[PDB]
Amino acid sequence: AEYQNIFSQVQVRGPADLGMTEDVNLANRSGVGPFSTLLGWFGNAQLGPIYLGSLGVLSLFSGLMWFFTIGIWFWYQAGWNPAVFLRDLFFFSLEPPAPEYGLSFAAPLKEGGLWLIASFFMFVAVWSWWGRTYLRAQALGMGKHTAWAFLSAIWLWMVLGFIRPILMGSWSEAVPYGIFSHLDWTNNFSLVHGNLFYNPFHGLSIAFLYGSALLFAMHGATILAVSRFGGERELEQIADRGTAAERAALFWRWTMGFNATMEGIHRWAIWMAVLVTLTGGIGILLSGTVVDNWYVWGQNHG
Amino acid sequence: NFDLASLAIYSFWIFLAGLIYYLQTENMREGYPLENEDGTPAANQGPFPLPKPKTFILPHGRGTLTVPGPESEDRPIALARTAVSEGFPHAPTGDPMKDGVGPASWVARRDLPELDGHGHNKIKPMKAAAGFHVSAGKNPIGLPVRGCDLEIAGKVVDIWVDIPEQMARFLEVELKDGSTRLLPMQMVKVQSNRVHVNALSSDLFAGIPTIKSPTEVTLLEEDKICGYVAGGLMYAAPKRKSV
Amino acid sequence: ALLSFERKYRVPGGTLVGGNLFDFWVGPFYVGFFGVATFFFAALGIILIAWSAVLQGTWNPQLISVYPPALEYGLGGAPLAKGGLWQIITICATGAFVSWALREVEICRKLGIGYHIPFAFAFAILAYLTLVLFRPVMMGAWGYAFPYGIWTHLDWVSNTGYTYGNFHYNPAHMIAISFFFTNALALALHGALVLSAANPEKGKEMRTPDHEDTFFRDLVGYSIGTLGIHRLGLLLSLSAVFFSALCMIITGTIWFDQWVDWWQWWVKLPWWANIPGGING
Ligand code: BCL
Ligand code: BCL
Ligand code: BCL
Ligand SMILES: CC[C@H]1c2cc3[nH]c4c(c3C)C(=O)[C@H](C(=O)OC)c4c3nc(cc4[nH]c(cc(n2)[C@@H]1C)c(C(C)=O)c4C)[C@@H](C)[C@@H]3CCC(=O)OC/C=C(\C)CCC[C@H](C)CCC[C@H](C)CCCC(C)C
Ligand SMILES: CC[C@H]1c2cc3[nH]c4c(c3C)C(=O)[C@H](C(=O)OC)c4c3nc(cc4[nH]c(cc(n2)[C@@H]1C)c(C(C)=O)c4C)[C@@H](C)[C@@H]3CCC(=O)OC/C=C(\C)CCC[C@H](C)CCC[C@H](C)CCCC(C)C
Ligand SMILES: CCCCCCCCCCCCCCCC(=O)OC[C@H](COP(=O)(O)OCCN)OC(=O)CCCCCCC[C@H](Br)[C@@H](Br)CCCCCCCC
Ligand SMILES: CCCCCCCCCCCC[N+](C)(C)[O-]
Ligand SMILES: CCCCCCCCCCCC[N+](C)(C)[O-]
Ligand SMILES: CCCCCCCCCCCC[N+](C)(C)[O-]
Ligand SMILES: CCCCCCCCCCCC[N+](C)(C)[O-]
Ligand SMILES: CCCCCCCCCCCC[N+](C)(C)[O-]
Ligand SMILES: [Cl-]
Ligand SMILES: [Cl-]
Ligand SMILES: [Cl-]
Ligand SMILES: [Fe+3]
Ligand SMILES: [K+]
């Protein structure tokens, strides 16, 4: 058969790639980790090095303290028996404080307090990590597109767990930490707001989520299809268009009548994705603050 | 819009229309303005205008690229109209594999090698690439190369590797006369006892474009080689036996 | 009209059917035999929908809805007004989609590229064919397929899901969702990385793929590389859809009770089954 290039036929290895320096404070990069032949059939075999400054130490520590806080709660929910822990692992839930404690921190640890602690830790972890995304870009002289893109994800998370509960006047409106419980929450949220299929922002979010799958299938299939002309080498194709970029454009022009550039496909990409959680977080932020029932809103607003 | 949701959704649609507009103009930095088949500026360019140019500063002293700008093939195109009106194909006027047309097409990219983050040639033969070796999979160096006419076209004498990405990019193949050619790795099939190249018959190998220096390739040369081998799928088909 | 670089590629050849008969373009669009097949199937498809509107008595695009054969018709045919149209429009739909994949294969042939795109598309067609064709056939009626309407199909999604309780608990649907969200993560990041290299801080030189690896290693300790990431997006997104097909092909067929209750297999496993404590004892 013709070779498809989803996995590689031959792996090559050379000296560990320690990276570009630019302005990065090299005191804080680890050494390279192992090489994995398995990853190697699909992507790069090399693992590491990683950069861990102070902001990264904070983020990880805080992140771990979150997982832990939940874990403590779970093992406790499991009466300290590991059999029960493993058995019920998807049924355990760390729930927020009752409606009765509003936005206060007055609630007992076993009945709201731990949830606040966990949320505190997750807040510090994510935000510190956000700053990492900016600073690692900066040290290398690169654009801040990643940190901006990540902000759109942060937005939906921030709306669900912090902004919306603040605007609704209680932490009881926030999502519990639990595998089954957070799915139940999601279902319940829609039931209680007149079915989220009626929320125009929900519909957009889906358009974009599905569209991201459409787009990345298109894009990735396209780069692979032109990988015999060096397609994946997108920066140099940006700087000096080659037959790879041209055949790619023309595939699409001849299929659907218009097409992209090598740099431009990546702007369609970043936005297709980012609009998922943007529109998404609007949808939710408005739910119960401005609109109690999307079926009802729909009847009065086209 | 008495209500904030209505204001929100209406504002978002306006934004999305502006975003799509902006996105589409960003994607007109190459290949535009549209042209008639004779190469002149076409009459209807569409409702989107050309963006205001941007300039990229290329690294390693290699200049800048400003797009959009004066578009030009910078090579002659051996094809001729086959109809008296727009929209039909253009017959090659000679041998399209040699002429570089159709699926054998190449672009007049820079005739320098792609450089890496440190300004070193990106691709080099593995002999010249310190500490690089095959780490997994069947090593092709030494295998006979077979074209789609089921005839031996040569032997594999090296892998050309991308240093920074640590991957195989070409196989260097020695022909009957002792010269070598690069074959894209994406167009070969490393089998246990041979390398098989479906795109080309053995007689077409000599015709693969050569590289001016035996231990680097330039972007222009990459394009001609890759163009040529891909062209074989169409143009070598009368010599492609079943399989 | 033509892109500045396009003429060199507009050579004869690559068609799968009809030799040179349809080897030509209208504007930017390649036609070919499957271009003709596609137009024919789409056109008839739309005319029937446009008619089906008439018989519903509406023209509003947010009202128009073509409903499948009522569940009592089984896997037989129904009159045009009462199901027949949907059956014929599904045939036209499949015809148009499959014809579009085969046109795509033709463009690939003419352009000398790999067949990855139409292959990718084939996964979308299969998802569709699960919903309108494989699932209904395994269940015994066209009534189980979704109807063609902007809102009515959403009505169908919700009714279908709530038949099995909270649909979230379908485990193939959990995997499917994970691939969708991870794909969107991957697309954000990939878009963002390439652009951050192509468009570096003010006054500086374009960065290099080595900057892109370095950025990700510094951040998460790993870089998949640029061949990798395109392999990845294709895999994530195709996987999202494969699990979407799977999660439905099983629902109504191997599993038809409440999905939440499926997870009882794990809970009730014999070693920890009867240990007291926890949520489940
Ligand atoms: C996949 C699981 C369910 C389903 C679940 C949902 C849910 C849930 C939602 C949608 C939504 C949409 N769905 Mg649906 N949808 C299904 C199957 C389909 C099929 C199909 C033939 O299989 C089609 C064509 C559509 C089309 C659509 C759009 C009307 C709308 C936006 C989707 C989008 O952007 O996707 C990604 C694609 C792109 C960004 C590319 C462009 C696609 C365009 C917009 C499709 C236009 C369709 C047009 C209105 C009908 C044309 C028919 C003509 C006769 C040719 N759906 C199945 C039955 N769909 C959303 C909505 O808001 O509905 C009101 C929404 O919330
Ligand atoms: C019965 C259930 C309701 C319903 C209830 C809800 C609710 C409630 C919500 C959604 C939301 C969404 N739903 Mg809905 N939804 C339904 C039906 C559907 C259907 C369908 C076919 O029926 C589809 C396709 C969707 C699709 C979607 C998405 C478009 C959207 C979530 C986007 C996203 O990426 O979130 C995922 C992305 C995030 C959550 C971002 C999180 C980022 C943070 C910063 C990450 C931190 C990670 C942390 C550090 C731990 C990680 C550890 C590391 C791995 C080491 N829904 C039905 C009608 N849906 C959300 C939305 O936007 O609505 C408008 C939402 O809030
Ligand atoms: C109350 C509703 C239930 C529910 C019930 C269901 C049901 C029921 C289904 C899903 C399905 C899905 N759901 Mg669920 N689901 C719920 C909650 C969610 C949530 C959430 C955050 O809560 C999410 C993220 C999802 C996510 C998903 C996806 C895994 C999957 C949909 C994508 C898909 O199938 O694409 C597949 C893509 C297609 C079918 C696209 C086909 C496009 C074709 C090939 C081309 C058409 C071209 C067009 C006509 C041309 C137009 C003209 C041009 C534009 C010019 N669900 C709630 C709990 N979900 C669906 C699924 O898996 O289906 C297989 C499904 O049937
Ligand atoms: C914009 C829409 C999409 C999106 C975008 C997006 N997400 C992003 C970004 C962007 C642009 C990032 O830059 C950022 C990132 O870093 O990606 C690599 C991120 C990110 N998105 C993430 C997740 C995520 N995104 C999601 C969604 C989405 N993200 C959307 C679909 C989702 C969901 C729910 O669908 C999830 C779960 C993270 C991978 C990453 C943010 C990381 C973060 O904030 O971490 C804080 C928490 C920790 C640091 C603790 C982690 C602990 C580790 C397991 C390490 C263990 C510790 C140590 C190794 C030693 C001890 C271990 C033991 C062995 C003892
Ligand atoms: C497999 C992974 C993802 C994927 C991939 C994918 N889709 C693709 C491709 C690929 C690789 C293409 O090459 C092809 C393309 O050309 O894209 C621009 C395509 C395509 N994916 C499309 C849409 C699409 N993909 C989707 C999903 C996905 N596609 C996945 C998430 C979805 C949804 C709902 O999520 C939609 C809506 C089209 C843009 C395009 C296919 C165009 C095509 O087939 O055109 C020929 C047909 C017509 C022009 C019209 C046909 C008219 C019918 C006869 C009548 C309509 C009947 C229909 C069932 C009614 C629906 C009513 C709705 C309210 C439900
Ligand atoms: C949630 C997102 C998480 C991403 C980050 C995961 C956290 C991983 C943390 C790993 C801990 C790192 C240990 C390093 C500290 C140490 O003691 O070893 C250092 C030592 C050298 O120190 P030296 O003194 O020489 O250097 C200083 C001057 N240059 O190096 C080593 O021995 C080990 C290096 C190990 C690096 C490997 C990291 C791999 C990460 Br986890 C990859 Br495999 C996984 C992430 C996948 C992608 C996740 C995101 C996907 C969306
Ligand atoms: C109000 C919280 C907002 C963010 C949503 C957090 C819920 C997702 C947690 C999923 C389950 C994690 N856990 C603890 C079970 O492992
Ligand atoms: C959501 C549906 C969007 C469909 C997009 C169709 C755009 C194709 C435009 C092709 C351009 C053809 N022409 C003659 C105007 O140049
Ligand atoms: C899939 C194609 C979507 C193209 C987006 C174009 C949106 C047009 C919105 C214009 C604003 C309309 N309105 C009434 C809200 O003002
Ligand atoms: C017939 C539906 C076609 C859908 C394509 C949508 C095109 C959006 C054009 C943006 C309009 C430009 N504007 C007015 C925002 O500046
Ligand atoms: C998500 C909706 C897809 C975007 C469709 C809008 C783009 C239409 C582009 C047609 C312009 C082509 N043209 C004339 C510049 O060659
Ligand atoms: Cl750090
Ligand atoms: Cl942008
Ligand atoms: Cl060098
Ligand atoms: Fe890319
Ligand atoms: K070596």
mmCIF file of N, CA and C in Angstrom, chain C residues 75-108:
data_model
loop_
_atom_site.group_PDB
_atom_site.id
_atom_site.type_symbol
_atom_site.label_atom_id
_atom_site.label_comp_id
_atom_site.label_asym_id
_atom_site.label_seq_id
_atom_site.Cartn_x
_atom_site.Cartn_y
_atom_site.Cartn_z
ATOM 1 N N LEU C 75 -39.289 -1.048 8.799
ATOM 2 C CA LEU C 75 -38.228 -0.736 7.826
ATOM 3 C C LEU C 75 -38.787 -0.734 6.392
ATOM 4 N N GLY C 76 -40.109 -0.580 6.233
ATOM 5 C CA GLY C 76 -40.711 -0.372 4.916
ATOM 6 C C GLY C 76 -40.746 1.079 4.458
ATOM 7 N N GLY C 77 -41.523 1.328 3.405
ATOM 8 C CA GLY C 77 -41.699 2.657 2.816
ATOM 9 C C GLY C 77 -42.979 3.341 3.297
ATOM 10 N N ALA C 78 -43.011 4.666 3.240
ATOM 11 C CA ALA C 78 -44.207 5.422 3.626
ATOM 12 C C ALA C 78 -44.590 6.372 2.484
ATOM 13 N N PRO C 79 -45.858 6.846 2.445
ATOM 14 C CA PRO C 79 -46.186 7.903 1.474
ATOM 15 C C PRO C 79 -45.345 9.179 1.664
ATOM 16 N N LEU C 80 -45.044 9.833 0.553
ATOM 17 C CA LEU C 80 -44.388 11.113 0.528
ATOM 18 C C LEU C 80 -44.739 12.061 1.700
ATOM 19 N N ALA C 81 -46.007 12.267 1.998
ATOM 20 C CA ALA C 81 -46.384 13.194 3.080
ATOM 21 C C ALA C 81 -46.106 12.638 4.479
ATOM 22 N N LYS C 82 -46.060 11.317 4.596
ATOM 23 C CA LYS C 82 -46.086 10.652 5.885
ATOM 24 C C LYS C 82 -44.812 9.915 6.208
ATOM 25 N N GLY C 83 -43.737 10.202 5.491
ATOM 26 C CA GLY C 83 -42.453 9.511 5.732
ATOM 27 C C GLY C 83 -41.599 9.282 4.487
ATOM 28 N N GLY C 84 -42.285 9.031 3.369
ATOM 29 C CA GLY C 84 -41.627 8.699 2.107
ATOM 30 C C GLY C 84 -40.544 9.676 1.693
ATOM 31 N N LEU C 85 -40.842 10.973 1.864
ATOM 32 C CA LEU C 85 -39.920 12.021 1.477
ATOM 33 C C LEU C 85 -38.665 11.892 2.281
ATOM 34 N N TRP C 86 -38.806 11.653 3.570
ATOM 35 C CA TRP C 86 -37.594 11.574 4.365
ATOM 36 C C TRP C 86 -36.715 10.472 3.858
ATOM 37 N N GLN C 87 -37.328 9.333 3.534
ATOM 38 C CA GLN C 87 -36.604 8.140 3.053
ATOM 39 C C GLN C 87 -35.850 8.461 1.786
ATOM 40 N N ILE C 88 -36.510 9.138 0.842
ATOM 41 C CA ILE C 88 -35.868 9.553 -0.427
ATOM 42 C C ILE C 88 -34.789 10.636 -0.222
ATOM 43 N N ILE C 89 -35.061 11.587 0.673
ATOM 44 C CA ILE C 89 -34.065 12.636 0.998
ATOM 45 C C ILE C 89 -32.816 12.041 1.700
ATOM 46 N N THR C 90 -32.992 11.044 2.560
ATOM 47 C CA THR C 90 -31.834 10.350 3.129
ATOM 48 C C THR C 90 -31.003 9.662 2.001
ATOM 49 N N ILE C 91 -31.691 9.096 0.995
ATOM 50 C CA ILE C 91 -30.976 8.470 -0.095
ATOM 51 C C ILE C 91 -30.198 9.565 -0.862
ATOM 52 N N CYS C 92 -30.877 10.674 -1.150
ATOM 53 C CA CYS C 92 -30.207 11.793 -1.775
ATOM 54 C C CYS C 92 -29.089 12.326 -0.902
ATOM 55 N N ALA C 93 -29.278 12.398 0.412
ATOM 56 C CA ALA C 93 -28.225 12.920 1.301
ATOM 57 C C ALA C 93 -26.911 12.106 1.242
ATOM 58 N N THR C 94 -27.046 10.820 1.488
ATOM 59 C CA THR C 94 -25.976 9.828 1.392
ATOM 60 C C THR C 94 -25.295 9.867 0.024
ATOM 61 N N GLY C 95 -26.122 9.881 -1.019
ATOM 62 C CA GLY C 95 -25.641 10.058 -2.410
ATOM 63 C C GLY C 95 -24.800 11.318 -2.593
ATOM 64 N N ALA C 96 -25.275 12.451 -2.056
ATOM 65 C CA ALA C 96 -24.538 13.703 -2.167
ATOM 66 C C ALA C 96 -23.280 13.692 -1.325
ATOM 67 N N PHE C 97 -23.327 13.059 -0.142
ATOM 68 C CA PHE C 97 -22.149 13.110 0.724
ATOM 69 C C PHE C 97 -21.057 12.246 0.161
ATOM 70 N N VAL C 98 -21.416 11.009 -0.184
ATOM 71 C CA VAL C 98 -20.495 10.018 -0.737
ATOM 72 C C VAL C 98 -19.977 10.501 -2.058
ATOM 73 N N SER C 99 -20.843 11.047 -2.909
ATOM 74 C CA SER C 99 -20.367 11.722 -4.126
ATOM 75 C C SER C 99 -19.373 12.835 -3.822
ATOM 76 N N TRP C 100 -19.541 13.593 -2.748
ATOM 77 C CA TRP C 100 -18.573 14.678 -2.442
ATOM 78 C C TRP C 100 -17.222 14.119 -1.976
ATOM 79 N N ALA C 101 -17.246 12.988 -1.267
ATOM 80 C CA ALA C 101 -15.972 12.359 -0.865
ATOM 81 C C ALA C 101 -15.223 11.903 -2.152
ATOM 82 N N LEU C 102 -15.952 11.360 -3.141
ATOM 83 C CA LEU C 102 -15.339 10.798 -4.319
ATOM 84 C C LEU C 102 -14.833 11.931 -5.244
ATOM 85 N N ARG C 103 -15.530 13.077 -5.243
ATOM 86 C CA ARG C 103 -14.994 14.280 -5.918
ATOM 87 C C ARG C 103 -13.697 14.677 -5.254
ATOM 88 N N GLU C 104 -13.665 14.659 -3.939
ATOM 89 C CA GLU C 104 -12.459 15.011 -3.235
ATOM 90 C C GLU C 104 -11.249 14.114 -3.620
ATOM 91 N N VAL C 105 -11.495 12.813 -3.736
ATOM 92 C CA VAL C 105 -10.520 11.826 -4.167
ATOM 93 C C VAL C 105 -10.024 12.214 -5.560
ATOM 94 N N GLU C 106 -10.964 12.596 -6.438
ATOM 95 C CA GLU C 106 -10.581 13.081 -7.779
ATOM 96 C C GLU C 106 -9.620 14.296 -7.763
ATOM 97 N N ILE C 107 -9.906 15.295 -6.925
ATOM 98 C CA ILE C 107 -9.021 16.496 -6.774
ATOM 99 C C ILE C 107 -7.620 16.100 -6.274
ATOM 100 N N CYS C 108 -7.603 15.227 -5.274
ATOM 101 C CA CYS C 108 -6.378 14.640 -4.802
ATOM 102 C C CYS C 108 -5.587 14.020 -5.930
#
